[PDB]
C-alpha cells in the first residue's frame, strides 16, 4: 500500500493488541519477586539491589500489609541532587546512610520528589492501563497490585517495565515487522537541546541533569561530539553501593572505570533506521534507550523507550526524575 500507510495499520494493531492483553499477560509463567520492608536501612537496601542484581524493589509495609511504594535508582538521584545545590555542606549527603526507606521517601516526599501516593494498576486490567499509567508520568516501571479480598491486604504481584512491555510485543506482534518508516520522517525521540557530558563532567553534575531533565541516562561524547559512553542512573547505585558518597565528586571518567562488566550495551542507530529493527533489537538484547548517531558516531538524537512506547500507544532546581 505504502511504507507510511503500513506503519499506520501496524501501529493500529500494536495498539489494538496492547489493549486486549492484561498486564498479567506479560508476566512469565513463573517468576520471582523481591520485595523490601520499608523499614530497611538505606545502606542495607542498597547492598540488596546489588547482590540480587536488580535496580528496584517494591517496598512492603505490613503493619499495613499495604504497598509502600517503589524503590528505584531515582530515589537516590533525587535526594542526591537535592543535597547538592542546596545545603552548603558537601558531606551532608552521607547522612543518607542513617535513613530508612521510610525516612528517605519521607524526605523525598517533602521536597516534591514523590507524588502524594505512588502509581496504579491491577494485573488483570488491560495492559493499556499500564502504559497509560507509565505514559502519564515517566514512572518507567509500574507495580501490579491486587487486593486479597478475604484480608483486605494488597498483594504485590510484579513490576512491569517499559522494556518488558515492549519486548513482550516485539514477541507477540507480527506487526512490528511492518513498521519501516525512517525516523527522520516521524516525530519521535529528542533531537535538540540534548543533555550530554564529557568524561570530565562531575558525576554529581550529571546527576543534576538526570533529575531536572527527568532522564535515566546521559550520552557521553568527546570534543568532536563522538559518542563514547553513557552515564545511567543505575550507574549511581554502583558508585555508592559501599557508602562512599565522595565517590560522587569523580569525573564521569574515573567513575566509569568502576563500572563492573555486567552492563547492558550502549545501542546506536541511524536517523534512517526504523522501529521494525529497533524492535528486533529489543526482542534479543536489553536495550533501555538507543542513540541516534551519524556515520561518525556523532550524536544526532536520543530515541528512548518511553519515546517508543508512547509513540505506539495513541496517535490521534526544577526538578525530579521519575523512575528507573
Amino acid at each position: 500500500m505504502d511504507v507510511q500507510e503500513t506503519q499506520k495499520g501496524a501501529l493500529k494493531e500494536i495498539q489494538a493488541f496492547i489493549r486486549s492483553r492484561t498486564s498479567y499477560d506479560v508476566l512469565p509463567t513463573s517468576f520471582r519477586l523481591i520485595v523490601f520492608d520499608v523499614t530497611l536501612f538505606v545502606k542495607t537496601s542498597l547492598s540488596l539491589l546489588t547482590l540480587n542484581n536488580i535496580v528496584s524493589a517494591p517496598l512492603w509495609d505490613s503493619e499495613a500489609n499495604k504497598f509502600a511504594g517503589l524503590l528505584t535508582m531515582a530515589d537516590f538521584v533525587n535526594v542526591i541532587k537535592y543535597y547538592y545545590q542546596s545545603s552548603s555542606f558537601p558531606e551532608a549527603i552521607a547522612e543518607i546512610d542513617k535513613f530508612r526507606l521510610l525516612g528517605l521517601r519521607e524526605v523525598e516526599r517533602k521536597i516534591g520528589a514523590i507524588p502524594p501516593e505512588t502509581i496504579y494498576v491491577h494485573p488483570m486490567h488491560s495492559l493499556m492501563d499500564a502504559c497509560l499509567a507509565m505514559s502519564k508520568s515517566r514512572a518507567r516501571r509500574i507495580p501490579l497490585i491486587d487486593v486479597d479480598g478475604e484480608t483486605g491486604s494488597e498483594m504485590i504481584v510484579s513490576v512491569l517495565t517499559q522494556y518488558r512491555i515492549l519486548k513482550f510485543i516485539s514477541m507477540n506482534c507480527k506487526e512490528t515487522a511492518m513498521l519501516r518508516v525512517p525516523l527522520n520522517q516521524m516525530t519521535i525521540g529528542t533531537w535538540s537541546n540534548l543533555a550530554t557530558a564529557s568524561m570530565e563532567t562531575k558525576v554529581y553534575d550529571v546527576i543534576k541533569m538526570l533529575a531536572e531533565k527527568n532522564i535515566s541516562a546521559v550520552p557521553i561524547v568527546n570534543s568532536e561530539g563522538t559518542l563514547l559512553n553513557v552515564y545511567e542512573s543505575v550507574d549511581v547505585m554502583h558508585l555508592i553501593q559501599d557508602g562512599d558518597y565522595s565517590n560522587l565528586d569523580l569525573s564521569v571518567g574515573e567513575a566509569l572505570l568502576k563500572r563492573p562488566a555486567n552492563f547492558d550495551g550502549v545501542h546506536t542507530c541511524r536517523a534512517t533506521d526504523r522501529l521494525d529493527g529497533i524492535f528486533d533489537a529489543i526482542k534479543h538484547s536489553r536495550v533501555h534507550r538507543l542513540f541516534v548517531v551519524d556515520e561518525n558516531l556523532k550524536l544526532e538524537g536520543i530515541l528512548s523507550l518511553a519515546d517508543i512506547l508512547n509513540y505506539i500507544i495513541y496517535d490521534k532546581t526544577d526538578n525530579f526524575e521519575s523512575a528507573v
Binding site: 505490613s62 503493619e63 500489609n65 479480598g149 478475604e150 484480608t151 483486605g152 498483594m155
Partner: protein
Amino acid sequence: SRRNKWHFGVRCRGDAPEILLAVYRALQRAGAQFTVPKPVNGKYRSDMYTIKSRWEIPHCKREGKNTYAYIELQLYEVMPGCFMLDVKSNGYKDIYSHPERTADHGMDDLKSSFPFLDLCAMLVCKLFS
C-alpha cells in the same frame, strides 16, 4: 549464593522434644494459638511434631475485623541432631464473609503470601530470642 542460600523453613539442632518446646513457646509468646499433642492413651506419637496454629492477622485486628491466619508447622529430622522446622500457610479466613458477598466459582480466589510471610517472620524473631 555461597551455601548461604535458599532452603525450606528453619534449620534446627539438639533434641526434637526441646525444639517442639521452643516452637510452642515461640508461638506462645507470639500470640498464636496452637494445636496441642494428644496421646493414644499409653502416651504420644510422631504427629506431636505437626502443630497447627491460628494467628490473629495483626492489621485485621487493629481495624475492627476478626480474621485469622492458619499455619501448620512440621518438624523433620534431616540427619541426627539436625532438623527443619517446616512452616506452611494454609490460609486466611475472616469469620464470615464480608458484611455481604462471596463471588467464587473459579478457581478459588487469591491466596497471597502475606500476611503469611509477615508472621513467618514474626515467628522467626521469636524462635531467635
